[PDB]
């Protein structure tokens, strides 16, 4: 979050938590009430047969 003077006042890590992922995907520093699609769960293979 850049200020008007060119310095940064806050930062959000996208991988910190689902709330942070919502903050990153909305590209806004404040999340309004509702539901937002953020990621896509995919089960990965474990063995090669």
């Amino acid at each position: 979050k850049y200020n008007e003077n060119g310095t940064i006042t806050d930062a959000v890590d996208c991988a910190l938590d689902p709330l942070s992922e919502t903050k990153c995907t909305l590209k806004s520093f404040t999340v309004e009430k509702g539901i937002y699609q953020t990621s896509n769960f995919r089960v990965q293979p474990t063995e090669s047969i």
């Binding site: 709330l19 992922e21 919502t22 009430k33 539901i35 937002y36 953020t38 896509n40």
Partner: protein
Amino acid sequence: DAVRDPQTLEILDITPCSFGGVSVITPGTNTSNQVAVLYQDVNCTEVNVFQTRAGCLIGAEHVNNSYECDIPIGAGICASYQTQSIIAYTMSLGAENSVAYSNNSIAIPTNFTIS
């Protein structure tokens, strides 16, 4: 969809690996930082855990009482932030109101409003 094992004469069904969208259900950050995670069309075994027709909900506690929908989840489930945590419940389509119907009774208004 189905294959035969070259060594043993058996038939095996191939199911695509579980996958689906992941959404976040939360009130505004002006109220609280508590969130809940919704996994679309994924069984909860493959991941406060709840299983619904919409998928798997983690972080929300399902209750029996019904209210108006606040944050729509789907398939008959809506979530709300209540005193405090996030809860999920089946909607109420409105307060029930029986009409005292008969064959010789009429209701006539006596006062009015301008809206």
